[PDB]
Amino acid sequence: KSEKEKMLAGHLYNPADLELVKERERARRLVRLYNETLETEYDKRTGLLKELFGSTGERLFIEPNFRCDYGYNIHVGENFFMNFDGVILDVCEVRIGDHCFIGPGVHIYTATHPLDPHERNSGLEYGKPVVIGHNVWIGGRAVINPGVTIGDNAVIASGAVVTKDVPANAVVGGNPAKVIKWLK
Amino acid sequence: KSEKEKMLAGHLYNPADLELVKERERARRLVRLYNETLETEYDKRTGLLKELFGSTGERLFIEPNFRCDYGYNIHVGENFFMNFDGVILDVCEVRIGDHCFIGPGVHIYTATHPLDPHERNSGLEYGKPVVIGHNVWIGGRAVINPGVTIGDNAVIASGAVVTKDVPANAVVGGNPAKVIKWLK
Amino acid sequence: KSEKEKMLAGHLYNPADLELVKERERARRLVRLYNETLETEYDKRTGLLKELFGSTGERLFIEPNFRCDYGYNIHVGENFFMNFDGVILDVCEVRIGDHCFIGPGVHIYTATHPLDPHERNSGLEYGKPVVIGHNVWIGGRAVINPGVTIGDNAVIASGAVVTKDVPANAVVGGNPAKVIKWLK
Numbered sequence A, B, C: 001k002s003e004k005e006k007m008l009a010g011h012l013y014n015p016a017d018l019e020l021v022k023e024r025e026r027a028r029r030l031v032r033l034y035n036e037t038l039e040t041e042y043d044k045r046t047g048l049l050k051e052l053f054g055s056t057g058e059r060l061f062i063e064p065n066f067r068c069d070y071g072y073n074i075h076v077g078e079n080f081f082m083n084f085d086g087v088i089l090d091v092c093e094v095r096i097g098d099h100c101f102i103g104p105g106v107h108i109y110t111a112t113h114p115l116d117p118h119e120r121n122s123g124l125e126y127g128k129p130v131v132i133g134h135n136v137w138i139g140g141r142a143v144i145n146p147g148v149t150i151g152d153n154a155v156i157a158s159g160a161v162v163t164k165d166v167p168a169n170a171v172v173g174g175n176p177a178k179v180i181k182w183l184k
Helices: A003-011 A017-036 A043-052 A117-121 B003-009 B018-036 B042-052 B117-123 C003-007 C019-034 C042-052
Strands: A060-061 A065-070 A074-076 A080-082 A086-089 A094-096 A105-107 A130-132 A170-174 A176-183 B060-062 B064-066 B075-078 B079-082 B086-091 B095-096 B106-108 B130-132 B170-174 B176-183 C060-063 C066-068 C079-081 C086-089 C095-097 C107-109 C129-131 C170-174 C177-183
Touching: A003 A017, A003 A117, A017 A043, A017 A065, A043 A060, A080 C019, A130 B086, B003 B018, B018 B064, B042 B060, C003 C019, C019 C042, C019 C066, C042 C060
Parallel strands: A060 A080, A065 A086, A074 A094, A086 A105, A094 A130, B060 B079, B064 B086, B075 B095, B086 B106, B095 B130, C060 C079, C066 C086, C086 C107, C095 C129
Antiparallel strands: A170 A176, B170 B176, C170 C177
16 A cells, blocks of 8 residues: 555555655645735635645634644534644544634644654654544643544643543543543 | 623623624734744834733833734733743733743633533633733743733743642642742 | 853853844844745755754754754754744753654743742843753653753653653653653
């Protein structure tokens, strides 16, 4: 299989692969055009995001700066909002539900390395997809790690570092994040 | 009450309100002009901030990038310094005393959402002000949450997530931050 | 002893020193040029980094935006990689070995203030060097504090706030970070 096929499937892959490199340059190009848009260019922003992302709802809004790796692995639901200076390393799929509110400086990662140093120095990496449900609030400066599923109506406290699955209707905070409050 | 009056009073309000939208655009405009200034343009930087913020002392300096929501809700004391890549969501007042040193990547939030998903989905938000005393050091990458007061001479360790009031002369650290020692 | 000599030696120094302000301006100029480079301008980026940093290996790559204080205090080994939106406050030396992987939003600090409220209000600062071994993975959004040394083959979990030395072959995580796993 190609490096891109391995990447998308969650297997070890070489990022220096020519096809993957070109796709990263294309994401970076669209992100650069996005980050240069004036604060009143709403339609132009919407247009750029729908071209960047794999799929969207009717509307979405993101404050510059924004960063991502590929673009096409990000799928967001209706009425998506992400505040200033976010980063989504979408080596694998990032799938987000409807009515997501994401605060500023939020980082969502699918990209990872082997823990063993010889395995890591091979220069092979992989990814684990991230799934975020409907009606999720992600507090500012939270970090969502690869492989994490967040249930519907979950609240992520600001600054929380989420290393495991978050149950639906739960509030999590801390590092590593733990359930603090059950909503019902 | 206008939506702006409800916002400033800590009441639920609609950020889509036309007046608030214009005010947010005007703030992003000034922030855009600021973030584009050269590293040598000290006087232009000062004037931009004194127009952006509600009040200042004689001298202040902020390393780009900087981000805020309204600008006019930010009040800083003498010799204010904020290092690279700060965010202040100033839906309500953010009042900071004299001789503050704020490290890079620091986020201060006054904006918040209802916890209930349906109430949150209404689009209505609210805020709680943040008050920071004199001679405070906020270490790099700290998060200061809505409604928090930080006493005079307090130190916020780098990376601390501050969820509750910080006593004067206390050092706090962790997520959630706790008092780790006392000063002076 | 000039303010620069005291800065480098780890003593109290005044950052407003004219020589230091010039050096800080020079660094920001080079950083501004770097951050404006296109995603396809690999050779331009390499040249700029090799001009900005104190020493490098043959190959290195950093995703904009990047921030630093002086540049010349940063020394990186072979195949250095740093992802989006990193900050390195290099008031004192930051020495990093070969094959380092640094995630996005990583902050490495050498700059610090007196904790004592009287001393800090002098406005004088100091620094403590940071040393990072070979084959280290620093997870995105990690914070590395002044005077910390990280041993060879160590892994810093995403979001970890590192306040003390990390042993070779350890995985650390949390805030303050602690050893969570041993590799060797």
